[PDB]
Amino acid sequence: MVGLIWAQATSGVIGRGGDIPWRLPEDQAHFREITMGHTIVMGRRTWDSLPAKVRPLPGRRNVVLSRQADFMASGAEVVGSLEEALTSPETWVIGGGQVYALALPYATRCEVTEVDIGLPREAGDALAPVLDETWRGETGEWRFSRSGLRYRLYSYHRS
Ligand SMILES: NC(=O)C1=CN([C@@H]2O[C@H](COP(=O)(O)OP(=O)(O)OC[C@H]3O[C@@H](n4cnc5c(N)ncnc54)[C@H](OP(=O)(O)O)[C@@H]3O)[C@@H](O)[C@H]2O)C=CC1
């Protein structure tokens, strides 16, 4: 089982300038709940964007994809191919744009948080993968964040 987990602006933007273009702390707990105790796979830039205090993410086997066969990532496993990254039965791909695209074909689950923020796609942005009709989804109710942003959760599956 390979799952993808991400948060996106309605527009599809998931990252800009090396960061996430919004604040939504309420998301942190759902992320933690889905990923805890499993192997998590991320691209090298996502690793670098993780704050030093939670790098590596505690309670998870952190796997980092990189084409630098010498890249240093303390507390994480550096692999150079996607096949090497996906050996665990329950693996959650947590980013970024490149890695989500690369892993989508292997995925049977996606936990998506939609953020109701006006943020048009700009050139160079990290973007969320587009789910076609092989996916059957379940949409949650909109909620308000203390940040002021409305957000909801989607759970997608495909056998
Ligand atoms: N909103 C959300 O839910 C999330 C948003 N993000 C955002 O995403 C952005 C980063 O995304 P993005 O720029 O797409 O980067 P990625 O995190 O996907 O990392 C890309 C890097 O992964 C490595 N890589 C990619 N493909 C391969 C491959 N096929 N084989 C080996 N190594 C590979 C390379 O490392 P190297 O260059 O070292 O070879 C490459 O530079 C940031 O802005 C981040 O904040 C991240 C996670 C979640």
What is the per-residue DSSP string for 117-129?
------TT-EEPP
Taking the C-alpha atoms of residue 64 and residue 45, their distance in angstroms, rounded to an integer, is 9
Q: Which letter does DSSP use for residue 11 in this model?
A: T
Cα 26 to middle of ligand 1, angstroms: 23
List the determination method: X-ray
Domains and CATH numbers, the chain: 1-159 (3.40.430.10)
The CB-based long-range contact list for 75-82 (8 Å cut-off, 24+ gap) reads 76/47, 82/106
97 is in an annotated binding site: yes
69 is in an annotated binding site: no
* 54: its two tokens: 């939670």
Map residue 154 onto helix, strand or coil. strand
* 28: its two tokens: 């942190």
Cis-peptide into 15, omega within 30 deg: no
Q: Which residue in the block uniquely carries the two structure tokens 């987990």?
A: 5
Map residue 142 onto helix, strand or coil. coil
Output the ligand 1 site: residues, CB below 6 A. Answer: 6-7, 14-15, 18-20, 42-46, 49, 65-68, 71, 80-82, 94-99, 102, 126
Note whether 107 and 4 are within 8 A (CB).
yes
140 is in an annotated binding site: no
Note whether 57 and 50 are within 8 A (CB).
yes
* 81: its two tokens: 């191919």
Rounded to 5°, angle at Cα 97 from 96 and 103: 85
Atom of ligand 1 nearest to the CA of 8: 1
Nearest to 1 by CA among 130, 155, 106: 106
18 Rama sector, left if φ>0, alpha if ψ -120 to 50, beta otherwise:
left
Resolution in angstroms, to 1 decimal, for this deposition? Answer: 2.0
Nearest to 106 by CA among 65, 152, 142, 71: 65
61 is in an annotated binding site: no
- The residue whose CA has the least distance to atom 7 of ligand 1 is 15
Contact residues for 50 (Cβ-Cβ < 8 A; gap 6+): 56, 57
Rounded to 5°, angle at Cα 79 from 78 and 81: 155
Map residue 2 onto helix, strand or coil. strand
User: Partners of 114 in the beta sheet?
Assistant: 8, 152
Cα within 13 Å of Cα(59), Cβ side: 7
**Which secondary structure element, helix H or strand E, spans residue 157, and what is its range?**
strand 150-157
